Amino acid sequence: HHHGACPSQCSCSGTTVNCKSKSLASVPAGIPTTTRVLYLNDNQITKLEPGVFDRLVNLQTLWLNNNQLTSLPAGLFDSLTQLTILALDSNQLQALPVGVFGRLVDLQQLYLGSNQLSALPSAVFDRLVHLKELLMCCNKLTELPRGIERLTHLTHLALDQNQLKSIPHGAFDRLSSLTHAYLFGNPWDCECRDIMYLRNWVADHTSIVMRWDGKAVNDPDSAKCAGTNTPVRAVTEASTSPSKCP
Ligand SMILES: [Cl-]
């Protein structure tokens, strides 16, 4: 290199900075402002300093997955207006701050799977008008996050392996571009008449309901009534009650 630009412990080509799997405990200093792709995944990063990405206005892809993050500072991504892919999966995130994605108006893919999220700010997805993939398996969600119902460009939505018991009426009706919907691994409450929306939705969308074995597997029987092998799509009206709702 007839000129510097690559942090210690990373490898760089073009506008890519690759610090993946480098045994890092923190974000390296001196990442160039011209960087478009930043790999910080598969490290031991436990916190991100407020402002650490403020300079990186040209970032299109940011991989922070497979670290040890438990929270994000407010405003962390506010500079990243060009960002189209953000991966935060396989961390220990217990909350998201208000407005954390508010400036990411060009975002297309958001990975939040394998964290400890139990609830989310109500407007957390509201500015993500172009979003195509929202992957949130393997958290602690007990209700469908408000806002997903308005993400009309979604092709991929993963909600599997949470603690969801039902889907609010009509919640998926605007999501007419879905090709992959992951719903398995939730304790769907088939006692409650509220399940009939999900029952009918799966019945009407059997080709897009998926499970995951390393790749997508079409299986509309994979959304099951809690504790049983009974598919939610097979639930009868007669078997539900307008008052076993939790
Ligand atoms: Cl996921």
**Do residues 195 and 189 touch, judged by C-beta distance below 8 A?**
yes
CA of 154 to the centre of ligand 1 (A): 14
The pair of three-digit structure tokens given for residue 232, joined into one six-digit string: 């939610």
- The single residue listed with the structure tokens 């438990």 is 70
Distance 100 CA to ligand 1 centre (A): 19
Q: Yes or no: say if 120 and 145 are a contact pair by the CB < 8 Å rule.
A: yes
CA distances from 97 to 38, 82, 93, 125, 184 (A): 22, 20, 11, 12, 28
Print burial letters for 225-243: b (CB count within 10 Å at least 16), e (below 16): beeeeebbbebeeeebeee
Resolution (A): 1.7
Structural domain harbouring 161:
1-246
Sheet holding 61-63, edge to edge: 11-13, 16-18, 37-39, 61-63, 85-87, 109-111, 133-135, 156-158, 180-182, 209-212, 216-218
Experimental method: X-ray
Ligand 1 centre to CA of 180 (Å) is 12
Structure tokens at 143: 């209700």
Q: How many domains does the chain have?
A: 1
Asked if residue 55 lies in contact with residue 29, where contact means CB atoms within 8 angstroms, the answer is: no
Q: Which residues surround ligand 1, an ion (CB under 5 A)?
A: 113, 135, 137, 158
Asked if 170 and 146 touch (Cβ cutoff 8 Å), the reply is no
First vs last Cα of the chain: how many Å apart?
63
191 CA to middle of ligand 1, Å? 27
Mapped onto helix, strand or coil, the DSSP state of residue 181 is strand
- Burial string for 156-182 (b: 16+ CB within 10 Å, else e) reads bbbbbbbebbbbeeebbeebeebebbb
Q: What is the DSSP letter of 28?
A: P
For 115-179, the DSSP string reads S------TTTTTT-TT--EEE--SS--SSPPTTGGG-TT-SEEE--SS------TTTTTT-TT-S
Distance CA 82, CA 91 (A): 24
Q: What does the alpha-carbon distance between residue 179 and residue 107 come to, in Å, rounded to a whole number?
A: 19
